[PDB]
Structure formats: structure tokens, C-alpha cells
Ligand binder design. Sequence first.
Ligand code: CO
Length: 277
Amino acid sequence: FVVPDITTRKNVGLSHDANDFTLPQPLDRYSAEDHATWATLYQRQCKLLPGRACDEFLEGLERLEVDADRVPDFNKLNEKLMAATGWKIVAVPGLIPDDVFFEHLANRRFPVTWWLREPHQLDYLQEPDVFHELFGHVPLLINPVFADYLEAYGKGGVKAKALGALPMLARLYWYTVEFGLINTPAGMRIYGAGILSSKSESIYCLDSASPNRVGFDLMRIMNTRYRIDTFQKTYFVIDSFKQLFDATAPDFAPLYLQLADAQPWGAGDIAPDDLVL
Ligand SMILES: [Co+2]
């Protein structure tokens, strides 16, 4: 039997803008259970993440006043975010078209799935939900260097789509924004949103001998496959958010055409020129 997925179930009776796929955050659809599930996830992650999350992430939660006890009001968070970096979050039903996603980031709008997992899925949800996309992705948007990286990333969507290279950018996003690590003199820390919202990946990614930790390299990353249904076999490590922003400076067009005919690295591969940490 095929049954409707969570995105479909949650958006029953709702709509979205035809062009940008946004809707006003539907605050009336959040139940008591939703606020309680949010509070449980927030409390869980805030216990796990000290000494694991990069300091900027934890500071961003505080500066944006991300609610600990309820699903945040996007408009209220935006007052803080706009003043900091001119960014805002916009509500979306779930997955949106790539060109729209990129156009959002290019215009300093960060799309956030509005709905939350059910408490029976506290441990993990495959689909991005509002906990992953707000708690995991948004706090670093008050960092002007990271925000500028996302903007530059967004702006690259037009050229990438024109050249059939959106999957090459998707790899860059995955291995930075979603699953990136940042080395510090205090030790390795986490900036990837997919790790920051996870129950257990933040333990594995710093404590396990199993995954590879490889220095950031743009071409390597854009030539590396990923999988969505398992902990990462490889994490890419930056020294600074400036490294990400600066990586967007050159013309990606000739990089895409070179990659197009190449065989990609497997998710668990170490490449001959990797700086292995
Ligand atoms: Co994400």
C-alpha cells in the first residue's frame, strides 16, 4: 500500500506562493504536542552540543533568541536576523524546486520547512523538518561571512542550472552547509546543520575513528558522491568560514565542464591528493 507522506499530510488545507513557494508560517497548525516535541529536541541537542558545535552556532541560538519551549515565530526571529545580516527566513511546505531554492539564497532568504516531526520520530526524520531547518541551519546566518557564503552559493544556481551542474553544487552544499566540520585550536568542531540537529551523528563525527576527515577542497568536493540514509563516510574540514566564501570567488563554469566527464569519488573514498586529518 501507498499512503500519503508527512509533507502531504501536514500541508492539507494549505497553499503557497506560485512563484517563490512560500506561505505565511501557519502558527495555528502547531499543536501542544508540536511545541513539546520542539522543546524536547532543543533540550536534547543543547545538552549534547557543548564542546562539539562550533562556538558561533551556540552563540547564534542565543542572539536570535531561538525559543527553547515552542516552535519559533519566524517573523519574530527575522527582526533579529535582518538587523544582523539582512537575511530572513521564509516558510515553505517542504522540498521546493532547486531554481527557487537558489533564488531564495541569492536574495538572502533561507527557506525553512514549517512543520515538525511527530514525537514518535524524535530520534530521526529523513525529511527535513522545522527543527532541522531552523535549529540546525539558521543560527550561523547571523555570521556575516557564513551568510555571504550562502548568498554567493545561491547566486551560482543560474549558471549551474544552465550547464546541467546543479548536482555538483548540491555536493558542495551537502559537504559544507549540511555536514561540514571546522577545525579550531580547541579541537575539531561542527558547523553542518545535518549534524547539529542529529541525535548521534555529532558523537560519531568527532569521536569515531571510522569516518575520514579531509581538508576542504572545492574540486574534490564537487566530484564526491553522497548518501542521505546513513552517517557520512567522509567529512570535509574548513579552517574558517572565510575559506568557504573565498571558494566561491572563481568562475565555476570551467570546473563543471571538467567534472562532467570525470568519475566521481565514492562517499567513502580517500583521493590521492587529500589532506587527511
Ligand atoms: Co539541511
